[PDB]
Design a binder for this molecule. Structure first.
Ligand code: A1A72
Length: 167
């Protein structure tokens, strides 16, 4: 039993809710919140820009030190950093950004990072400004993630299409 509330159950382990991931993380304070990161951990917009704003830019400061030490992530890769005031940890996951020409096949590799954590609050990878079809992203999530994932979908219109079209 966990404190996630108001989710629709899609499968044994995947759940979905129309919610602002920023407001969700603040309420739940989950062990792990997933960020829709880029390889440079430049949290300028989309989910990443919103999560970083909620940390008063502390996420960006920590991320800049991480990159200065370690260099960029791989597309499909991840790193674990602090969750600041939002969660215990933030799993920064890089899904392919279609608006950069990155291979959508790397979306499965991106979701595999979730399997290293028993429970996560997360967005759909490569959705929003990363340009992929959120329906496809949900399919890859369900077919790849085996741990317990709570998906927050900001857009109410998009949520209904994902539920109604889910196989
Ligand atoms: O796939 C993640 C979505 N974005 C967010 N998801 C959850 N919580 C969030 N908080 C701030 C942004 C955000 C994506 O960017 C998106 C945005 C608009 C539309 Cl129409 C469709 C898809």
């Amino acid at each position: 039993v966990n404190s996630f509330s108001g989710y629709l159950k899609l499968t044994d382990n995947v759940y979905i809710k129309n919610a602002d991931i920023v407001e969700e993380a603040k309420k739940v304070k989950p062990t792990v919140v997933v960020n829709a990161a880029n390889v440079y951990l430049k949290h300028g917009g989309g989910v990443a820009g919103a999560l970083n704003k909620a940390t008063n830019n502390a996420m960006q400061v920590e991320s800049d030190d991480y990159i200065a030490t370690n260099g960029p992530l791989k597309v499909g890769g991840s790193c674990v950093l602090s969750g600041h005031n939002l969660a215990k940890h933030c799993l920064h996951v890089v899904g392919p950004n279609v608006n950069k020409g990155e291979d959508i096949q790397l979306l499965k590799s991106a979701y595999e990072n979730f399997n290293q954590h028993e429970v996560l609050l997360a967005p759909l990878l490569s959705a929003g400004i990363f340009g992929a079809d959120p329906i496809h992203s949900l399919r890859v999530c369900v077919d790849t993630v085996r741990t317990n994932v709570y998906l927050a979908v900001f857009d109410k219109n998009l949520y209904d299409k994902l539920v109604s079209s889910f196989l």
